[model samples]
Target chain A: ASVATELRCQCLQTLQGIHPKNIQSVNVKSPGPHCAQTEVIATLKNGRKACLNPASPIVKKIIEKMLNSDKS
Target chain B: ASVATELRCQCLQTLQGIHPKNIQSVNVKSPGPHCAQTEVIATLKNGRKACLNPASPIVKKIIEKMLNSDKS
Candidate 1:
């Protein structure tokens, strides 16, 4: 189990990109007392999870797509 | 246990907004076979989770802030 108040980053390392189709969910953790950097965690279709680089182009693109999805 | 391929939306309802300070993490689930609409789920500081309206301006603003934070 994870503690909400833990003062550390959840992600130890992040991937460059993963196929969007293989992602089940994407969680974006904003920097707080727990972490000084933005962390993006993605759940894969196979029930596995992966950490994503927030600054990665693919991650930004996926976020943008999700934001735009709200309109459609 | 939840199935990875389950075709049901995780969020049944969503909040207009919750103080960003109270949020521990935000998960954006893109529309897929599991759901037809975008879902924003937020974990609060109290270790509880809530669904956020993807269309809400406040949610959009918070996401924008988070994106901006990446540059700082």
Candidate 2:
């Protein structure tokens, strides 16, 4: 049987509207096993980590912008 | 001026439709600086990493499902 990874989701709450340009890296963790929720963590250029709201329309646009660039 | 963290995108191509249950972790990297495209890398339970197509319909649903779970 599968086991849970870690104990729970890392983000207790989420932030939004940080431009992607200031983001150094973004990690999107899948739900289940570890936790029942998806998590978006961004590492800023200044070496700080921020939790992003996955459902935020701004975030959705940011995610899509990043993904759309894959083809170009 | 901002500098890229990596030289380029890690995934040359992407795979689709791998069940989230089989996935151990997923990382989404934004475009610009390092690479001009978004990259989705999934680490399977077997310890191998696979690239996922950002444009894949299956991928879109998978991402959405994980994010939606964040609220529940």
Point to the candidate with the largest TM-score. 1
Listing every candidate in turn, what is its Cα RMSD in Å to the true structure after a full C-alpha superposition?
6.5, 7.4
Kindly list the per-residue Cα lDDT of model 2 for residues B35-67, writing each as its tens digit: 666667776667566677757898776555544
Q: Highest DockQ: which candidate?
A: 1
Interface RMSD (Å), each candidate? 2.3, 2.8
| Local accuracy by lDDT, each model | 0.66, 0.63
Model 1 bad stretches (over 4 Å)? A1-12, A31-36, A67-72, B1-12, B31-36, B67-72
Judge candidate 2 against the unseen true structure and give its global Cα lDDT, from 0 to 1. 0.63
In candidate 1, how many Å is residue A63 off?
A: 2.0
TM-score of 1: 0.66
TM-score of each: 0.66, 0.60
Candidate 2 regions with alpha-carbon error over 4 angstroms? A1-13, A31-37, A46-48, A69-72, B1-13, B31-37, B45-48, B69-72
Q: Every prediction's TM-score for the first chain?
A: 0.59, 0.60
Docking class of 1: medium
